[PDB]
Design a protein around this ligand. Structure first.
Ligand code: HEM
Ligand SMILES: CCCCCC/C=C\CCCCCCCC(=O)O
Length: 455
């Protein structure tokens, strides 16, 4: 039999839209998922899609033969400034595959070995900042993490120094980026977009998009006039040719790739580091574990690519935090052809599916009766994890291109942090997750007491 698609309350023409009227749509969806189960329909004026939570359905949606990446309404809005960069372009769009081939090289084992040096340059600035702090002062976690992350990707990928640590006030780019994301998020809940109330929001949107592009222009101009021979993402965007077409990326797309790597290559990571640290502080013994592991592997003042690969446990911390709170909370698919999801739900071609990643990682049938617990050990034997049970980095051909960059950076820094400081939850911070499409702990602050070890 065919099961009637379960779905939340409707408000006439508004459908389920009013349900999403909030600062935290994903978390709301999680609750609705909790109340409706493995799958439900969410309809709104014009659009309609199905949010999946269970692995059994996820594993199906994650079948390239039947489902390809769909641009969720969120991403459609992000396209306004991210254009057809990797993250926001359709699979069957010339620029995607092209850029994929052209840019992929910048994320190989060897490359990571080259980036590592610069990563440490930033990581040190961080430890330095935290070491230069005095008694009464405390650290603002996600603020400094984002500070770290943007600087790292900028240097590593474009050889441009945002110098985030040289400013107490948020780098302009960040400020405009968060606003553009936030607006993208707000548009999802809008009933009538043309309403002259949104006029202001639109003027501000353009404003922030322009600021982002202004930076791109500075990054490129800075590259032109420099003593080069840099083998980074930038030189690859500007020079690499897609071997399948022999053609290189056009300026319009190259721009899009810069914006894309600047945003995608920093936000999700800092969010990850913030959540990780949150959990470590809230789970002292796990912290203690990760602290010792670090203390013994990082024998050198400044960590090596290999020593970082030796930070087994801290990596587990990372995947656990990434399990409970996946920074990029969801990805979308579409029925490549008419089919039937789970043998119960009939899908027509082009039917949108939405994967609530944070829920998939709470599936007790996979993780057990304690899903809500921060237990790094769950990742002691990676082999145990059924595929499609842990999908924090997207799926298949359209998966995180920078995945390893993130984890290598996160591990490095998390390792160093635990190596040099005593972190105290001086405020018993209650978790508050701020949503800007991406997830991050807001107002998370701590105090780092020096172990007084140099670097
Ligand atoms: C913990 C951090 C990160 C998380 C959780 C994350 C997650 C993801 C996810 C879920 C997607 C797929 C979205 C979809 O299927 O619609 C994705 C795509 C992508 N990510 Fe990441 N990401 C992270 C870090 C990075 C970094 C550091 C870079 C680059 C330096 C990066 C670059 C990209 C790009 C370009 C894509 C588009 C891939 C494509 O569709 O061709 N990501 N990432
Ligand atoms: C290219 C720009 C960087 C990527 C920014 C967005 C990253 C991931 C998107 C997560 C979307 C989560 C959707 C929640 C909102 C909803 O479903 O209604």
């Amino acid at each position: 039999t065919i099961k009637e698609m379960p779905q939340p309350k409707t408000f006439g023409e508004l459908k389920n839209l009013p349900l999403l009227n909030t600062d935290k749509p994903v978390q709301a969806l999680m609750k609705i998922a909790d109340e409706l189960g493995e799958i439900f329909k969410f309809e709104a004026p014009g659009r309609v899609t199905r949010y999946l939570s269970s692995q059994r359905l996820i594993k199906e949606a994650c079948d390239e033969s039947r489902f390809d990446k769909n641009l969720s309404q969120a991403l459609k809005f992000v396209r306004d400034f991210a254009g057809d960069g990797l993250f926001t372009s359709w699979t069957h769009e010339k620029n995607w595959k092209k850029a994929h081939n052209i840019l992929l090289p910048s994320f190989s084992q060897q490359a990571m070995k080259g980036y590592h040096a610069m990563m440490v340059d930033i990581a040190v600035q961080l430890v330095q900042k935290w070491e230069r702090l005095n008694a009464d002062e405390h650290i603002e976690v996600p603020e400094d993490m984002t500070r770290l992350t943007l600087d790292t990707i900028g240097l590593c990928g474009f050889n441009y120094r945002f110098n985030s640590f040289y400013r107490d006030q948020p780098h302009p780019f960040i400020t405009s980026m968060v606003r553009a994301l936030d607006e993208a998020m707000n548009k999802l809940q809008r009933a009538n977009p043309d309403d002259p109330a949104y006029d202001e929001n639109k003027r501000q949107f353009q404003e922030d998009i322009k600021v982002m592009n202004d930076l791109v222009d500075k990054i490129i101009a800075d590259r032109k006039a420099s003593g080069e021979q840099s083998d980074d993402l930038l030189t690859h965007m500007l020079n690499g040719k897609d071997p399948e077409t022999g053609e290189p990326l056009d300026d319009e797309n190259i721009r899009y790739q810069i914006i894309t790597f600047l945003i995608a290559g920093h936000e999700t990571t800092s969010g990850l580091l913030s959540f990780a640290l949150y959990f470590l502080v809230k789970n002292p013994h796990v912290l203690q574990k990760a602290a010792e592991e670090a203390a013994r592997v990082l024998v050198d003042p400044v960590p090596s690519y290999k020593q970082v690969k030796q930070l087994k446990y801290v990596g587990m911390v990372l995947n656990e935090a990434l399990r409970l709170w996946p920074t990029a909370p969801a990805f979308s698919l579409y029925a490549k052809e008419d089919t039937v999801l789970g043998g119960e739900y009939p899908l027509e071609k082009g039917d949108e599916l939405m994967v609530l990643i944070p829920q998939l990682h709470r599936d007790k049938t996979i993780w057990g009766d304690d899903v809500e617990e921060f237990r790094p050990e769950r990742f002691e034997n990676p082999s145990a994890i059924p595929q499609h049970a842990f999908k924090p980095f997207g799926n298949g051909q359209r998966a995180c291109i920078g995945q390893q960059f993130a984890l290598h950076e996160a591990t490095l820094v998390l390792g160093m942090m635990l190596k040099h400081f005593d972190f105290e939850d001086h405020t018993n911070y209650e978790l508050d997750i701020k949503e800007t499409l991406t997830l991050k702990p807001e107002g998370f602050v701590v105090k780092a007491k020096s172990k007084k070890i140099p670097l």
